[PDB]
Amino acid sequence: EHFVSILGKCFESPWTTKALSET
Amino acid sequence: FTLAEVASLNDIQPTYRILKPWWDVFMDYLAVVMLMVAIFAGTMQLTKDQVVCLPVLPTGRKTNLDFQQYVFINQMCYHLALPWYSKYFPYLALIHTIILMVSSNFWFKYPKTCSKVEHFVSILGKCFESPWTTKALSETDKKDGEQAKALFEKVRKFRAHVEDSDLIYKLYVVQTVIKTAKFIFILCYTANFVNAISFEHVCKPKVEHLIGYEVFECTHNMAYMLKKLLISYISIICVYGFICLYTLFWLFRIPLKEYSFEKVREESSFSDIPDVKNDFAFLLHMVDQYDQLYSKR
Amino acid sequence: FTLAEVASLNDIQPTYRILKPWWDVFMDYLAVVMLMVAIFAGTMQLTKDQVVCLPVLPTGRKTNLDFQQ
Amino acid sequence: VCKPKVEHLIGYEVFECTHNMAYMLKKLLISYISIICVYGFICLYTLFWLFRIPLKEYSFEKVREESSFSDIPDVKNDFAFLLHMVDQYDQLYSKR
């Protein structure tokens, strides 16, 4: 349950795509 | 037993008013009607099914038979002198309706498929909730700017994601032709015995050293009601295959369906804000069949 | 007689679009269809179960019995 | 054909019944067995293949391959992770 919470909160972070469009 | 409100809850999509064209809604609603007719057939078949035989001449006639070999004799005739379609029809109709509805929507709940479809409905739902879009359309705060900037980045991430010879188009084509094959299958079968149903049945089983009376006849009890319910079923499936073959052959043949590039290109041509105007193997003109506004915005 | 409604609905999971492969879905829906076969089996089995015997012979042979035998 | 022991009750020893279920139950049986043969064949074969082959420890080098075209130094993922199986839903969430 907590693991699905990890990934379901992991997906929407805009910093992730800000750092993936960076390098 | 096996009612509509549990056959529906076997298989239903969560909330998607979008990604259902009008012909898909008529397929779903008419399949529910056909399941209602099949379950009414099952109830009426379980209610009053019994046959009744009696023998030939070799006032009234006595013949000296007790009641119990009468119920043996119409049991034995009921499993020998009946057509297979005289008593296996509603259960086969139930099976075929279940296969029809889940072949209507297993395109939609396939795990390689449902990912990008769920993600696309999430993209369009988040894309409709930005009031900057209607502000810029009013032309041609302070939060939706950076929200729409992050959503821009989601958009051209998603654009780079779904670019293959996709399983959406191929899966939907093979799904439609297999349910059309099921249509052709049952309407090829059922004409033969809507042509010939019967009310009275002569029978000659092998039970002669049990009672006697080698030739004797039954009447069956379904014939009028089951024949009328059968022709209503034929009408329903005729309308279903009509709508299915008509709209789906024309939607397969008239566009190229990878011309969503062309339709967003036309949209850019009259939109006064020239967009990227090119997209491959893409889903969006189904949403256009739902509503043009969710494609424009 | 363990009716079909709760036996169907006692398998649902709320948000797990993740954590199912293709065969989780195939095994799940296929077992639902097999449950439908079993429930229809139980209903039809309870409906018209009865057998009917009669004696061998050694017009209508009477053999002189009564219904409750 | 039945031979019950109730002889001092009616007077008959060898006689017969018919059974109302036989044809419907046999056809329902072969439908049930076709369903279960499909079930067991599919789930046996594909669970054999996702039992033997990835051996539940290659997700470390999988995340290393993930990093190998994302321009980030690689990390050794797991000892006990379900991240293979989430991978069978999407490659996207394993990348992301």
Residue numbers in the entry:
A (entry chain B): 194 to 216
B (entry chain A): 2 to 59, 135 to 216, 277 to 433
C (entry chain B): 2 to 59, 135 to 145
D (entry chain B): 338 to 433
Question: What does the literature reporting this entry say, word for word?
Answer:
The volume-regulated anion channel (VRAC), also called the volume-sensitive outwardly rectifying anion channel or volume-sensitive organic osmolyte-anion channel, is an anion channel activated upon cell swelling. The VRAC-mediated transport of chloride ions and small organic compounds, including osmolytes such as taurine or glutamate, drives water efflux to counteract cell swelling. Biochemical and biophysical analyses demonstrated that hetero-hexamers containing at least one LRRC8A isoform and at least one of the other four LRRC8 isoforms (LRRC8B-LRRC8E) form functional VRAC channels. The LRRC8D isoform is particularly interesting, because its incorporation into heteromers is requisite for the permeation of many organic substrates, independent of their electrical charge.
In this study, we present the 4.36 Å resolution cryo-EM structure of the human LRRC8D homo-hexamer, the largest isoform in the LRRC8 protein family, which is important to increase the permeability to organic substrates in VRAC. The final 3D map was reconstructed to an overall 4.36 Å resolution (local resolution of the transmembrane region is ~3.9 Å) with C2 symmetry imposed, and contained six subunits of HsLRRC8D (hereafter referred to as α to ζ subunits). Overall, HsLRRC8D adopts a homo-hexameric architecture composed of four regions: extracellular, TM, and intracellular regions in the N-terminal half of each subunit, and a leucine-rich repeat (LRR) region contained in the C-terminal half. The overall HsLRRC8D structure displays a twofold symmetric “dimer of trimers” arrangement; in other words, the structures of the α and δ subunits, those of the β and ε subunits, and those of the γ and ζ subunits are identical. Our HsLRRC8D structure revealed that, in addition to the threefold and sixfold symmetries, LRRC8 hexamers can form twofold symmetry. Notably, we discovered an additional N-terminal helix (NTH), which was not observed in the previously reported LRRC8A structures. It is formed by the N-terminal residues preceding the TM1 helix and protrudes into the channel pore, as in the previous structures of the connexin18,19,25 and innexin20,22 channels, which show weak homology to LRRC8 proteins. The NTH is formed by the Ala5 to Asn11 residues at the N-terminal region preceding the TM1 helix and closely interacts with the TM1 helix. In the HsLRRC8D structure, the Leu4, Val7, and Leu10 residues face the channel pore, whereas the Ala5, Ser9, and Asp12 residues face the TM1 helix. The sequence alignment predicted that the most constricted site is formed by the Phe143 residue, as its aromatic ring restricts the pore diameter to 11.5 Å.
